Amino acid sequence: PIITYHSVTVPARCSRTFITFSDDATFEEWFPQGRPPKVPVREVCPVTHRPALYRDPVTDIPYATARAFKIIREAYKKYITAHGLPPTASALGPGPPPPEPLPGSGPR
Amino acid sequence: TQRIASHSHVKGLGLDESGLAKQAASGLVGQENAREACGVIVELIKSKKMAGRAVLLAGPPGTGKTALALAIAQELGSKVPFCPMVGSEVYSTEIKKTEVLMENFRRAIGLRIKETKEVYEGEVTELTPCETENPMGGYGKTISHVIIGLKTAKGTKQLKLDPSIFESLQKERVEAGDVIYIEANSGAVKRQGRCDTYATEFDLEAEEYVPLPKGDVHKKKEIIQDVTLHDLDVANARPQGGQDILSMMGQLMKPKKTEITDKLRGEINKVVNKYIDQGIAELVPGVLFVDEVHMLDIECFTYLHRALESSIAPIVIFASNRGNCVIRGTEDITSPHGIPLDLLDRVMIIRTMLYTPQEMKQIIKIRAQTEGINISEEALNHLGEIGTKTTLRYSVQLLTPANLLAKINGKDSIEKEHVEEISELFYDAKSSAKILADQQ
Amino acid sequence: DVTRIERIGAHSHIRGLGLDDALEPRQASQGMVGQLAARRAAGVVLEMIREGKIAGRAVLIAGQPGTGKTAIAMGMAQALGPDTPFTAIAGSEIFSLEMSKTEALTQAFRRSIGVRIKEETEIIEGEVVEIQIDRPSKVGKLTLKTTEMETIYDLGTKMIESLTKDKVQAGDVITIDKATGKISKLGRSFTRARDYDAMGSQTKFVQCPDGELQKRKEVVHTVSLHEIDVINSRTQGFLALFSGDTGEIKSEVREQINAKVAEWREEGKAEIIPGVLFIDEVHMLDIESFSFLNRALESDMAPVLIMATNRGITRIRGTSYQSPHGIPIDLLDRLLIVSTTPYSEKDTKQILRIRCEEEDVEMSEDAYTVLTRIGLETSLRYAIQLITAASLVCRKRKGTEVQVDDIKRVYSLFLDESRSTQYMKEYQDAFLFN
């Protein structure tokens, strides 16, 4: 029994509550506590950048536009062989203007 | 732009600091004695000492007696209630005539409720129980506090709450990252959602990732809401609790008006007085305006005898244009203004006069300015002659058609020819009535 | 400042009838002045009401307008006090769409009869010294004290439910109904712990109860017969007390209620407190209404009826005939008539003096003389209404007393019936539907 209430008033004259959970195991299922990730990873499209939209496809990694989706699906046909050339090194013109240069679009 | 009505040019009574009437100010011209009297009436209303004192505005048609009542509303501002009604509105199919009057008497009495509360809110981060082992006896493990840490925008703070909150806490099903609401007097927890930091390209939830609040973690909120006594009567008369079947039964059967009893009025007056004494509420007695009061029945007037004698009642303004006319509800009883003498002894009468041609011309110019119309001097003089011949209101009505006619002809202002054409396309009541002898 | 809902009305200055112990009226007392014979008669009627033996007596107050009929009625109302009922209506109020005229008059009659129900109850009242609940079926223990004694209670389950729903905790002062276990919290004697954050309402304190923890006490509840009717009219009919949907309560319910109230009276449970029904401007009633009143006044549960009217020989509504006071002589034979006379110069002056005191207005003696002559010439109510206007005019010129010039100013601004009618006759072509 978890003892929902216990008040005694004894000291200044006062009034308190002393909840006594008992049974050991009852404590943590009433106080599991928490440690969530405060923020997520901010996702960026591999193709032309900007924040990600929709989600990942049925496989692989997220995208921003239908054109990015089209390039990503034209990609990954170069990689299902599990061998070959670089599938993503500047593949299909994946938003190539370098104010700051870009790696290949192979984060998966 | 906002739409232009008949009395939109009226902005006040146009009185001096001494209360004397300017010849032309605040959209009104003339009626200096009546406007001075209305000045006295607005002072009476602002004093808030009096209940049930009544005023009658009497005079011929077109003398602006309706405008003076609306000028009284403008001087009082939006704080003071002003309830307009027509005498013909008492004839309802749902409730008796005297109930309609009492509903409008109560609508004119206002109340500002200034309740205050102090709260704590933000993103929960701890859910941390304290511990002191034993409650001075045979023991398992005892907590003695619950540490709750909130952070919203300005900072972070830890609160060591009463242990009793824990029951309510998982009743609300809170976890770390949620955002909550707790009231100081009661300690009652309420979950608002969880922060937008776990959102922004996640979406897909009916709870809504409610955004992380702004401001300090601890807040004192002062809410002011304006409400009438009739609103309190209507709200307290009904069983609004959805947990009862008859409440949702009320949805299907029609929620008609009902004849509210005096017991509810008395109890609401009692609790309103208690709120006023305790300082949570402020009373704002207002004005009831009954235009076309001659349409009321003898029963309505005889009820107003009692209603105006109440200590609760508001200031009432009546308006009529009838002469020595038969009282409605009686067979053959004539009385001045279509009103019984017994009620007429209970009111102070404000007389309104017919306007001179210069005053008509000035009002026409004001209305032309209000309607965004440019009119030449000879056109204005001819329109004033028309208003002298027929009626002020008829001449005022010709401005907009003449402006449209000028716009059709490419001109930017009204000349005499346009008003001349409009005066033959359209007829006044007197001219048409003379024509009725010709066309039978 | 602090404008309460009750402000200065037409009859606010009246606080009684101003009568001696021998019912002899004083010339000016309790806001009333003049009308000696009518006030004496009203005092006799008030004694009849107070004794309560005789049922269904009817009184009519008659006289010209402005002679204080309604003032005498409110004087009776204030002298009678709040413990006894006093139901006031206008004659026009019975013409409802929800119910018939006879039903409305029956409800008005039964609103004016009080039932003083009395019963015994036992309470437990004490300061909570300690409470414990071993929630896992729940069990617990409670401790209460007074200044005299202390006791520990082993709690049952439903008492624990009530305590938990009310969130009773130690330091509170509570009252527990022994019959059903309802709890009501009166306050606290000890502060809550200052270690706790956010639950820091200061509140106010209450003393510990005295004497025995458990006491038996008598309690008295007052309800009208109409309340008993509406409650018993239907299931969930109590809502009609506020909403007014009491449409045509069946007579069998009323007969049952009358029998039960009588047997309660014999069984010592209840006392009948017969009040007063006041109908101002009774000439609005139809012939059917008066015919119903003829028989309604013959019941033993009937209250004292008081009526006010001014008409002379005047048509009865719903008919083509004429009779005194607009009332048929079937009812006039059943009642006593009280006549109010017009006021003299001194009485008008005293009424205006009393009214200035109520409104907090100071005027000179010349102003009082001028306003008295105005009131004699036009009407008492007009002269009363000019007081506030003259005070406002004096205030806007930053004066301290209302002078004759302010009175003449408001006399010019605001018109009476006679002058307005004269000026209307001048503009008789301009006014409509002569």
From Swiss-Prot, chain A:
GO CC annotation terms, alphabetical:
NuA4 histone acetyltransferase complex; nuclear speck; nucleoplasm; nucleosome; nucleus; protein-containing complex
Q: Which is one GO molecular function term here?
A: histone chaperone activity
Please report the PTM annotation for this entry: Phosphorylation is enhanced by ZNHIT1 and promotes the interaction of VPS72 with histone H2AZ1.
Query: Any keyword Transmembrane helix?
Result: no
Q: What keywords are assigned to this protein? A: Chromatin regulator, DNA-binding, Isopeptide bond, Nucleus, Phosphoprotein, Transcription, Transcription regulation, Ubl conjugation
User: From its record, what is one biological process in GO terms?
Assistant: negative regulation of transcription by RNA polymerase II
| Bias (Pro residues) ranges | 94-104
Effect of altering I71V? Answer: In a breast cancer sample; somatic mutation
Query: Which region ranges are annotated with the description Disordered?
Result: 88-108
State where the protein is found. Nucleus
Which family is this sequence assigned to? Belongs to the VPS72/YL1 family.
The task this protein performs is described as: Deposition-and-exchange histone chaperone specific for H2AZ1, specifically chaperones H2AZ1 and deposits it into nucleosomes. As component of the SRCAP complex, mediates the ATP-dependent exchange of histone H2AZ1/H2B dimers for nucleosomal H2A/H2B, leading to transcriptional regulation of selected genes by chromatin remodeling.
Quaternary structure annotation from Swiss-Prot or TrEMBL: Component of the NuA4 histone acetyltransferase complex which contains the catalytic subunit KAT5/TIP60 and the subunits EP400, TRRAP/PAF400, BRD8/SMAP, EPC1, DMAP1/DNMAP1, RUVBL1/TIP49, RUVBL2, ING3, actin, ACTL6A/BAF53A, MORF4L1/MRG15, MORF4L2/MRGX, MRGBP, YEATS4/GAS41 and VPS72/YL1. Component of a NuA4-related complex which contains EP400, TRRAP/PAF400, SRCAP, BRD8/SMAP, EPC1, DMAP1/DNMAP1, RUVBL1/TIP49, RUVBL2, actin, ACTL6A/BAF53A, VPS72 and YEATS4/GAS41. Also part of a multiprotein complex which contains SRCAP and which binds to H2AZ1/H2AZ.
The protein's name:
Vacuolar protein sorting-associated protein 72 homolog
Chain's gene name: VPS72
Swiss-Prot record, chain B:
Places the protein is found: Nucleus matrix; Nucleus, Nucleoplasm; Cytoplasm; Membrane
Q: What is its EC number?
A: 3.6.4.12
The effect of E292Q is:
Reduces ATPase activity. Decreases interaction with NOPCHAP1. No effect on formation of RUVBL1-RUVBL2 heteromeric complex
Residues engaged in binding ATP? G59, P60, P61, G62, T63, G64, K65, T66
Which part of the chain holds the cross-link Glycyl lysine isopeptide (Lys-Gly) (interchain with G-Cter in SUMO1)?
K214
Instruction: Tell me, in one coarse class, where this protein mainly resides.
Output: nucleus
Q: In which tissues is it expressed?
A: Ubiquitously expressed with high expression in heart, skeletal muscle and testis.
Q: Which reaction does it catalyse?
A: ATP + H2O = ADP + phosphate + H(+)
Keywords recorded for this protein, A-Z: Acetylation, Activator, ATP-binding, Cell cycle, Cell division, Chromatin regulator, Cytoplasm, Cytoskeleton, DNA damage, DNA recombination, DNA repair, Growth regulation, Helicase, Hydrolase, Isopeptide bond, Membrane, Mitosis, Nucleotide-binding, Nucleus, Transcription, Transcription regulation, Ubl conjugation
Matches recorded under Gene3D superfamilies = 1.10.8.60, P-loop containing nucleotide triphosphate hydrolases (3.40.50.300), RuvB-like helicase, domain II (2.40.50.360)
* Record keyword Nucleotide-binding present: yes
For the biological process aspect of GO, one term held by this record is: regulation of DNA repair
Gene Ontology molecular function, alphabetical: ADP binding; ATP binding; ATP hydrolysis activity; ATPase binding; cadherin binding; DNA helicase activity; TBP-class protein binding; TFIID-class transcription factor complex binding
Q: What does this protein do?
A: Possesses single-stranded DNA-stimulated ATPase and ATP-dependent DNA helicase (3' to 5') activity; hexamerization is thought to be critical for ATP hydrolysis and adjacent subunits in the ring-like structure contribute to the ATPase activity. Component of the NuA4 histone acetyltransferase complex which is involved in transcriptional activation of select genes principally by acetylation of nucleosomal histones H4 and H2A. This modification may both alter nucleosome-DNA interactions and promote interaction of the modified histones with other proteins which positively regulate transcription.
Q: What is this protein called?
A: RuvB-like 1
Curated annotation (Swiss-Prot), chain C:
Gene Ontology molecular function, alphabetical: ADP binding; ATP binding; ATP hydrolysis activity; ATPase binding; beta-catenin binding; chromatin DNA binding; DNA helicase activity; identical protein binding
Superkingdom of this protein's organism: Eukaryota
Keywords, sorted A to Z: Acetylation, Activator, ATP-binding, Chromatin regulator, Cytoplasm, DNA damage, DNA recombination, DNA repair, Growth regulation, Helicase, Hydrolase, Isopeptide bond, Membrane, Nucleotide-binding, Nucleus, Phosphoprotein, Transcription, Transcription regulation, Ubl conjugation
Residue numbers bearing the Phosphoserine modification: S418
List the catalytic activities from the record.
ATP + H2O = ADP + phosphate + H(+)
Q: In which tissues is it expressed?
A: Ubiquitously expressed. Highly expressed in testis and thymus.
Main location (coarse class): nucleus
Instruction: Extract the SUPFAM superfamilies matched here.
Output: P-loop containing nucleoside triphosphate hydrolases
EC number, as in UniProt: 3.6.4.12
Entry-linked InterPro entries? AAA+_ATPase, P-loop_NTPase, RuvB-like, RuvB-like_C, RuvBL1/2_DNA/RNA_bd_dom, TIP49_P-loop
Indicate which residues the UniProt annotation says bind ATP. Answer: G63, Q64, P65, G66, T67, G68, K69, T70
Q: Name one Pfam family in it.
A: TIP49
- Glycyl lysine isopeptide (Lys-Gly) (interchain with G-Cter in SUMO2) cross-link: located at K425
Its job: Possesses single-stranded DNA-stimulated ATPase and ATP-dependent DNA helicase (5' to 3') activity; hexamerization is thought to be critical for ATP hydrolysis and adjacent subunits in the ring-like structure contribute to the ATPase activity. Component of the NuA4 histone acetyltransferase complex which is involved in transcriptional activation of select genes principally by acetylation of nucleosomal histones H4 and H2A. This modification may both alter nucleosome -DNA interactions and promote interaction of the modified histones with other proteins which positively regulate transcription.
What the entry says about domains is: The C-terminal domain is required for association with ATF2.
UniProt lists the family membership as follows: Belongs to the RuvB family.
Q: What protein name is recorded for this chain?
A: RuvB-like 2
Gene, per the UniProt record: RUVBL2
